[PDB]
C-alpha cells in the first residue's frame, strides 16, 4: 500500500489523476517526484519551474552546482537530485524537446530512467512546452516503465482526453 490517492489505475503499474505535480508532491511527500528537466537543469517553466518556484529557488541552487560540477545532461538521461521540501528526491529526467528538434525515439530513453526507481510521482514526458504529444507520450510511459508511476496531467482537457483515448 502506498499514500497516492483518487488515481485512475490504466495497467498493472500506471496510474494517472488530473492533478498538479506541484499541489501533489506537498501533499504526499513521494520518496521520487519526476523533474521535465532540461540538460542545463534552467528550470525557467513547465514542470521544472512550478517545482523550482515551489522550492523558493533551492532546487536552481542546487543544480546550479550540478552543472558546475558535472556539466549537461543527455537528452534522454537523467540525475537524482533533492526533492527539497516537495519529495525525498528529485529525478531530474530530460525528454527531448520538439520546440528544439530533438529524436522523439528519445522519449523511450528517458523513461527507461523511471525504472530505477521502485514507486515515482511523475508528469508525463516531453508533453506541454516540451511540444511532444501527450497521447503518445503516455503509450511509451506504458510500454516502458515497469515500476509504479503515479502521473500528475495538470490540464483537466488533457486528462480526460488521455484517459478517454487510452488502448
Ligand atoms: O504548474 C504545473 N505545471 C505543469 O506543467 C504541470 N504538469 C503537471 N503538473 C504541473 N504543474
Redesign the pocket.
Known sequence: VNSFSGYLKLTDNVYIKN????EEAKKVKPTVVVNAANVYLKHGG??AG?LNKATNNAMQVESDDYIATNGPLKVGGSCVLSGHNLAKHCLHVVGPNVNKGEDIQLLKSAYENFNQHEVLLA?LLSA?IFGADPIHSLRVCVDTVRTNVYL???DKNLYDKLVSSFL
Open positions: 492533478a498538479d505535480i506541484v513547465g514542470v512550478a508528469p506541454g500528475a496531467v495538470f
